[PDB]
Backbone as JSON, one array per atom type, in Angstrom:
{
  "sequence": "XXXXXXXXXXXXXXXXXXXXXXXXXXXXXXXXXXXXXXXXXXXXXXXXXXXXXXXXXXXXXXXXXXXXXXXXXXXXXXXXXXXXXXXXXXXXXXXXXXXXXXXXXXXXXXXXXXXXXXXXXXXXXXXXXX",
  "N": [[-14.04, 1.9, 0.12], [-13.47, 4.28, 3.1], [-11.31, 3.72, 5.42], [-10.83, 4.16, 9.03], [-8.61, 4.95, 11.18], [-7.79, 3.46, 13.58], [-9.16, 1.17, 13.28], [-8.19, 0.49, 10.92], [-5.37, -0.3, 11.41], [-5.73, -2.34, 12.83], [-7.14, -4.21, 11.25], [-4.89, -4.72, 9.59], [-2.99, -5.57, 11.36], [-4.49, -8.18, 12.1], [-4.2, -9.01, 9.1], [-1.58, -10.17, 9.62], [0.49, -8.27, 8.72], [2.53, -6.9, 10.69], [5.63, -6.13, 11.33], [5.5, -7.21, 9.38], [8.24, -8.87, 7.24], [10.34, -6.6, 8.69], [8.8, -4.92, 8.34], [7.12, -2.48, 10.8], [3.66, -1.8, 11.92], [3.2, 1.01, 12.74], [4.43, 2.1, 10.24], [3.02, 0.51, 8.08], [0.96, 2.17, 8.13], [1.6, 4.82, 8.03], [2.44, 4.81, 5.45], [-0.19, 4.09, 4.02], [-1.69, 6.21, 4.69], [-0.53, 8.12, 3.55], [-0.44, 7.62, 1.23], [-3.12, 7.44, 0.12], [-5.04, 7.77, 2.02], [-6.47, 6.45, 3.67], [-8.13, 5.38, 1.08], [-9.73, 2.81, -0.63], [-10.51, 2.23, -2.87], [-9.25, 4.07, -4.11], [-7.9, 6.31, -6.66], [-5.24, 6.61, -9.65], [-3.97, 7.39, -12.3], [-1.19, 7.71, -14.32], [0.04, 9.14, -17.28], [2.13, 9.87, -18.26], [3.69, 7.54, -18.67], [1.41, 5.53, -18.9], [0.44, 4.21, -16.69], [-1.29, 3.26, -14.02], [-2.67, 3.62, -10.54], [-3.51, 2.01, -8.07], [-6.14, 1.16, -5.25], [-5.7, 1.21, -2.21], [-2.82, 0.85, -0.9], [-1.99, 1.82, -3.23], [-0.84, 1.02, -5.84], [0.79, -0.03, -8.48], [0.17, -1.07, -11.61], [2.03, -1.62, -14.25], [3.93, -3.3, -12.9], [3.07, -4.85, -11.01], [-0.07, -5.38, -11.05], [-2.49, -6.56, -13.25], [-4.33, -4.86, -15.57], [-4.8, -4.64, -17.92], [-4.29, -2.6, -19.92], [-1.91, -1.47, -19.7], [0.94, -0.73, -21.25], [3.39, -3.42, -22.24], [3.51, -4.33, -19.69], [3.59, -6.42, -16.5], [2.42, -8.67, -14.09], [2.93, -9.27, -10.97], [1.58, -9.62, -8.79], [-0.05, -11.4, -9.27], [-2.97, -10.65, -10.04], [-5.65, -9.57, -10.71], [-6.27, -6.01, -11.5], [-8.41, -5.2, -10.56], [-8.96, -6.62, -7.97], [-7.41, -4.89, -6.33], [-9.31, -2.67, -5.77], [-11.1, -3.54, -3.97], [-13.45, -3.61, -0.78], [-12.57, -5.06, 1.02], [-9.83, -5.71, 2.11], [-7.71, -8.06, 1.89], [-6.39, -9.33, -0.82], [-5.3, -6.76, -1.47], [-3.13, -6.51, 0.34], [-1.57, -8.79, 0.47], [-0.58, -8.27, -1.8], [0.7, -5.9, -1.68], [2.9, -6.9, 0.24], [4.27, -9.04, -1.53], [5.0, -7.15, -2.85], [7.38, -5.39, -0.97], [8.7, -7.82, -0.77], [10.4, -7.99, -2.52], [13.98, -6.61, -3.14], [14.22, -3.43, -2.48], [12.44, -3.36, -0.77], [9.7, -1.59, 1.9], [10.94, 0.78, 0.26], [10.26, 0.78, -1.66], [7.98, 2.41, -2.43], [7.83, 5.41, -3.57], [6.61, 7.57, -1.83], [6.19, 6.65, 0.83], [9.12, 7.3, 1.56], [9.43, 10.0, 1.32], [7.53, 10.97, 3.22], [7.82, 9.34, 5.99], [9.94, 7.85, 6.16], [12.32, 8.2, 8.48], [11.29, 9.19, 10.35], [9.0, 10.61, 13.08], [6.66, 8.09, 13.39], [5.04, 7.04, 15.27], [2.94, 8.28, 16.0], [0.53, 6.84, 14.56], [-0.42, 5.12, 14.92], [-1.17, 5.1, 17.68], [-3.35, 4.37, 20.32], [-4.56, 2.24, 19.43], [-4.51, -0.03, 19.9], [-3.09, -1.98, 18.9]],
  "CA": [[-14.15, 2.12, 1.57], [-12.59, 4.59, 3.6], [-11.31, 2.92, 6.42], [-10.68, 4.67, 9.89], [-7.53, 4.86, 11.23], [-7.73, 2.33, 14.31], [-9.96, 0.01, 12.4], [-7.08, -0.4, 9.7], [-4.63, -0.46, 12.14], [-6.06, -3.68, 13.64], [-7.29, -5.08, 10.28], [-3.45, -5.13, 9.08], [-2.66, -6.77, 12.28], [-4.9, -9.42, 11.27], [-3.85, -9.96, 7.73], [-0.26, -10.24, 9.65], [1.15, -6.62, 8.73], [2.6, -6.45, 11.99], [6.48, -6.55, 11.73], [6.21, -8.1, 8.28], [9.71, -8.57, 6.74], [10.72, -5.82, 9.03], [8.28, -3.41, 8.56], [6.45, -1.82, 11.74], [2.53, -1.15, 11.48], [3.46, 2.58, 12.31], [5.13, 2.15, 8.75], [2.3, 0.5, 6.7], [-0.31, 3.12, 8.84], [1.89, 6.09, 7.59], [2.42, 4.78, 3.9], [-1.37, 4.01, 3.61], [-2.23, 7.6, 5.27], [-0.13, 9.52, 2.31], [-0.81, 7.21, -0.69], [-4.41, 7.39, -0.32], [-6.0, 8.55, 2.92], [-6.95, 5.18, 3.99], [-8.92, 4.8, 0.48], [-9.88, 1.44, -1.21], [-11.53, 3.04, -4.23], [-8.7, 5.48, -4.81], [-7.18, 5.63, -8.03], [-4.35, 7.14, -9.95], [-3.79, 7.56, -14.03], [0.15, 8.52, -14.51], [-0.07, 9.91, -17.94], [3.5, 9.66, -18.49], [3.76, 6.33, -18.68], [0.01, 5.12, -19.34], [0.02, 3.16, -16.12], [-2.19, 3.84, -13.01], [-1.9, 3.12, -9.21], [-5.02, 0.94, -7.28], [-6.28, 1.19, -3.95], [-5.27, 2.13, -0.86], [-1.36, 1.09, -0.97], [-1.6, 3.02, -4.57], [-0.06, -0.17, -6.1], [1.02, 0.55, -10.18], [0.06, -1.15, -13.09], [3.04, -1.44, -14.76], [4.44, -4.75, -12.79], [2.24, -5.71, -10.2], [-1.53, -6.23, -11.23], [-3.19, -6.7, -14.7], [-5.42, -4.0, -16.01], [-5.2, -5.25, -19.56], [-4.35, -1.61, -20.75], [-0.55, -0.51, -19.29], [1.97, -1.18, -22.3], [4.45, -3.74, -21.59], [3.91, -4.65, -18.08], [3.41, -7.33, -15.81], [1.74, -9.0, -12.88], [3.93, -10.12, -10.05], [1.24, -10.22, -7.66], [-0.95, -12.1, -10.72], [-3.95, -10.09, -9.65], [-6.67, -8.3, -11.71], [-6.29, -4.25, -10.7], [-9.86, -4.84, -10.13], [-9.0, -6.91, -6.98], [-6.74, -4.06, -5.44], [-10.29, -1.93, -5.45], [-12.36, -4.2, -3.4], [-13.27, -3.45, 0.64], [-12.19, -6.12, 1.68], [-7.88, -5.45, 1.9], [-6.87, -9.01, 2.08], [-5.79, -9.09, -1.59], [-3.74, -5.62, -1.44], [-2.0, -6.85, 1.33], [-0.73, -9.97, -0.13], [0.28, -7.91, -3.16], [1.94, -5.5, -0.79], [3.72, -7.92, 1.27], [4.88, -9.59, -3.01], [6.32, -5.87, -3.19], [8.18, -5.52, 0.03], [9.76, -9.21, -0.6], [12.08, -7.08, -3.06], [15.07, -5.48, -2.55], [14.01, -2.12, -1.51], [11.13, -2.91, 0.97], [9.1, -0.51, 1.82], [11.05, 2.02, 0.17], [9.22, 0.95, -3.12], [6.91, 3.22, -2.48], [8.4, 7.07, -2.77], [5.34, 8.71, -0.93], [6.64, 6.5, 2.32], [10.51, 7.75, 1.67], [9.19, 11.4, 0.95], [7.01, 11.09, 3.98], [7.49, 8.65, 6.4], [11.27, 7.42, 6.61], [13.53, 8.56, 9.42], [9.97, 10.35, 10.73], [8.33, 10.15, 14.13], [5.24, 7.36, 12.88], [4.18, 6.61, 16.37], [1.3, 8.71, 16.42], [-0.6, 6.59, 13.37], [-1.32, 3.23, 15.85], [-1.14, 5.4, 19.02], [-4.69, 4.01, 21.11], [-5.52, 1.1, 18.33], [-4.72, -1.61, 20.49], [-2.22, -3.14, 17.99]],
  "C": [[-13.01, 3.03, 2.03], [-12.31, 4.31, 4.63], [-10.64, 4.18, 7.96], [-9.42, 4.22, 10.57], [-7.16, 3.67, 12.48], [-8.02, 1.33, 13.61], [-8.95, -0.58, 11.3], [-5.89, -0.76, 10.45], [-4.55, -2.45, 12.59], [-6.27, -4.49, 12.03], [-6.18, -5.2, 9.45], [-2.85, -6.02, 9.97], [-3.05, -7.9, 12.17], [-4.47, -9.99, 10.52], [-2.18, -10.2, 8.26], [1.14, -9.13, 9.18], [2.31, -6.45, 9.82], [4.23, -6.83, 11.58], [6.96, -7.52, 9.87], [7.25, -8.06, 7.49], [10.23, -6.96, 7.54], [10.14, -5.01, 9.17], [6.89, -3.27, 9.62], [4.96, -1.67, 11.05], [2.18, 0.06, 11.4], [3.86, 2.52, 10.77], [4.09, 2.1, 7.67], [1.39, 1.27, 6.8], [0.11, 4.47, 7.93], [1.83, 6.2, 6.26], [1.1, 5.02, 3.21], [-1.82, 5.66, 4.09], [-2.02, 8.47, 4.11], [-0.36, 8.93, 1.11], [-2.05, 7.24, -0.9], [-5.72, 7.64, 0.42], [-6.7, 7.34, 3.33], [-7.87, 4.47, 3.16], [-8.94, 4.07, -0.28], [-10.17, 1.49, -2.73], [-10.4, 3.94, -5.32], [-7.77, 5.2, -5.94], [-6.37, 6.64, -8.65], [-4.2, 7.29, -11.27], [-2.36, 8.64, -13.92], [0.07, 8.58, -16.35], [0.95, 9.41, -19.46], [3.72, 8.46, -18.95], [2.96, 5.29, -18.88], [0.13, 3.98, -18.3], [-0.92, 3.84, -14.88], [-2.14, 2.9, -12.06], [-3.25, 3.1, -8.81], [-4.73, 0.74, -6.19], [-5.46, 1.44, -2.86], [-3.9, 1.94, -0.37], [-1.13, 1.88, -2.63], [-0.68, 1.97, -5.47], [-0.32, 0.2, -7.65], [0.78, -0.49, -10.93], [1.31, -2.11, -13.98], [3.96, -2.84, -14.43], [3.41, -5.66, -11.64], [0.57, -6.06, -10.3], [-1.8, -5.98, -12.91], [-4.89, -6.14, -14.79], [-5.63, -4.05, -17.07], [-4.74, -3.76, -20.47], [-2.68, -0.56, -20.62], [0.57, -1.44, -20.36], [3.35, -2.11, -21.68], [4.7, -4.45, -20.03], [3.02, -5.67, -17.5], [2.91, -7.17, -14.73], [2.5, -9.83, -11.93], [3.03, -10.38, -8.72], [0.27, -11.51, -7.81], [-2.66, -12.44, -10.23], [-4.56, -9.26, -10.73], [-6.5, -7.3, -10.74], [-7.9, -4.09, -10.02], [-9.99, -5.47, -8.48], [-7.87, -5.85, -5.66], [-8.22, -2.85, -5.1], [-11.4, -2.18, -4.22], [-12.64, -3.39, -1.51], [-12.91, -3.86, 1.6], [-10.26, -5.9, 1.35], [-6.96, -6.92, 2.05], [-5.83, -9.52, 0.63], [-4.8, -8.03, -2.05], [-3.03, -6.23, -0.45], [-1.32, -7.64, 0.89], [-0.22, -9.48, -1.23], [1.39, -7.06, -2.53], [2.97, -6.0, 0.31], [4.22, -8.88, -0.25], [6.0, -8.59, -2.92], [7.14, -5.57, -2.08], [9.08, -7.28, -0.24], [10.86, -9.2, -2.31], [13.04, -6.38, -2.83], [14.8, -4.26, -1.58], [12.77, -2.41, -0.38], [10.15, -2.53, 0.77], [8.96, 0.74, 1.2], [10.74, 1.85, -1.63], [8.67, 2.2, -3.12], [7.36, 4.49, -2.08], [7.75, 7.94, -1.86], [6.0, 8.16, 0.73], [8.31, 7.26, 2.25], [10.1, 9.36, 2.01], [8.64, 11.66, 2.77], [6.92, 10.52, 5.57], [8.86, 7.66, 7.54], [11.92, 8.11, 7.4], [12.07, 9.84, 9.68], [9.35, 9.33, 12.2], [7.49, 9.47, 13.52], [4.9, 7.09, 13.85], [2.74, 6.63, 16.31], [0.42, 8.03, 15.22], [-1.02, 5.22, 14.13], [-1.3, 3.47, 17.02], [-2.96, 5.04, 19.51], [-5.27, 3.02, 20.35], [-5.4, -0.17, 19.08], [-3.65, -2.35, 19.74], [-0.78, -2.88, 18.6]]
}
């Protein structure tokens, strides 16, 4: 699913997004905007490292879900990669709200640092109601 930019807005507010451990819904609106265009489906294969990044927070392989095929690595959200694909976002969220309740935050995720940090984000929940 590609989800529309109000419509996810509000359906993060729901799953409790809003403020979680600190972070603004401008924040998870802008992260989700550059890791994947608001898509559920979208998928990644890093090469380098034989791991690959699932659905629409772009979530890796490597420690947080079990794809049965990334050398070495673990499940901290102790999720099949197949449940970061679904249309339904209530399982990424709870994996992305696992990875924010580490050290760095938000700033896990380099696409939000690159893109996102010390950046106007207003305009991504401007008229959603949230």
């Amino acid at each position: 699913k590609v989800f529309e930019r109000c419509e996810l807005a509000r359906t993060l507010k729901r799953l409790g997004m809003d403020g979680y451990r600190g972070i603004s819904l401008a924040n998870w609106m802008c992260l989700l905007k550059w890791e994947s265009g608001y898509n559920t489906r979208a998928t990644n294969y890093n090469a380098g490292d034989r791991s690959t990044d699932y659905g629409i927070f772009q979530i890796n392989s490597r420690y947080w879900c079990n794809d049965g095929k990334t050398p070495g690595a673990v499940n901290a959200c102790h999720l099949s990669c197949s449940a970061l694909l679904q249309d339904n976002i209530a399982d990424a969220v709870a994996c992305a709200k696992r990875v924010v309740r580490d050290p760095q935050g938000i700033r896990a995720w380099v696409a939000w640092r690159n893109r996102c940090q010390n950046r106007d984000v207003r305009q991504y929940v401007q008229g959603c109601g949230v």
